[PDB]
Amino acid sequence: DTKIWNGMVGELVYGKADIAIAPLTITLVREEVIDFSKPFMSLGISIMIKKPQKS
Amino acid sequence: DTKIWNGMVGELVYGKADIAIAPLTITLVREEVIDFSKPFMSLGISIMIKKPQKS
């Protein structure tokens, strides 16, 4: 609605913060306003299930 | 010895090539001379063993 970044990006875009060292997912629209470094931690959606025991 | 980049980077640094779309591992010393994009394919060292035989 306002197209105003909240959160850490709103602290980075609006001069409130100097840098971010945080679990920030690199997306397209986030690089449109700030600059990421290269990723330090690759990840993806994973399947958490119960550890099974003796059906 | 010569500190001359061979390969695709030597084609990119020395103006021979315009861009690289190739399996190029992003390292520190490679970014010291050219600019990578964000990685399109995360990977790592994997363990190839024999598939369990059907004997």
Swiss-Prot record, chains A, B:
Organism domain of life: Eukaryota
Annotated compartments: Cell membrane; Postsynaptic cell membrane; Postsynaptic density membrane
Family to which the UniProt record says this protein belongs: Belongs to the glutamate-gated ion channel (TC 1.A.10.1) family. GRIA2 subfamily.
Domain notes: The M4 transmembrane segment mediates tetramerization and is required for cell surface expression.
Annotated effect of mutating L28Y: Promotes dimerization. Strongly reduced desensitization
Modification(s) after translation: Palmitoylated. Depalmitoylated upon L-glutamate stimulation. Ubiquitinated by RNF167, leading to its degradation.
Induction statement: Down-regulated in the pyramidal cell layer of CA1 in the hippocampus by global ischemia.
Subunit architecture: Homotetramer or heterotetramer of pore-forming glutamate receptor subunits. Tetramers may be formed by the dimerization of dimers. May interact with MPP4. Forms a ternary complex with GRIP1 and CSPG4. Interacts with ATAD1 in an ATP-dependent manner. ATAD1-catalyzed ATP hydrolysis disrupts binding to ATAD1 and to GRIP1 and leads to AMPAR complex disassembly. Interacts with GRIP2. Interacts with GRIP1. Interacts with NSF via its C-terminus. Interacts with CACNG2, PICK1 and GRIP2. Interacts with GRIA1 and SYNDIG1. Part of a complex containing GRIA2, NSF and NAPA and/or NAPB.
Residue span relative to the full protein: 477 to 531 of 883
Miscellaneous comment: The postsynaptic actions of L-glutamate are mediated by a variety of receptors that are named according to their selective agonists. This receptor binds AMPA (quisqualate) > L-glutamate > kainate.
Organism: Rattus norvegicus
Protein name: Glutamate receptor 2
Tissue specificity of this protein: Detected in forebrain. Detected in dendrites of neuronal cells. Expressed in the pyramidal cell layers of CA1 and CA3 and in the granule cell layer of the dentate gyrus.
Residue numbers binding L-glutamate: P23, T25, R30
Lineage of origin: Eukaryota, Metazoa, Chordata, Craniata, Vertebrata
Function comment: Ionotropic glutamate receptor that functions as a ligand-gated cation channel, gated by L-glutamate and glutamatergic agonists such as alpha-amino-3-hydroxy-5-methyl-4-isoxazolepropionic acid (AMPA), quisqualic acid, and kainic acid. L-glutamate acts as an excitatory neurotransmitter at many synapses in the central nervous system and plays an important role in fast excitatory synaptic transmission.
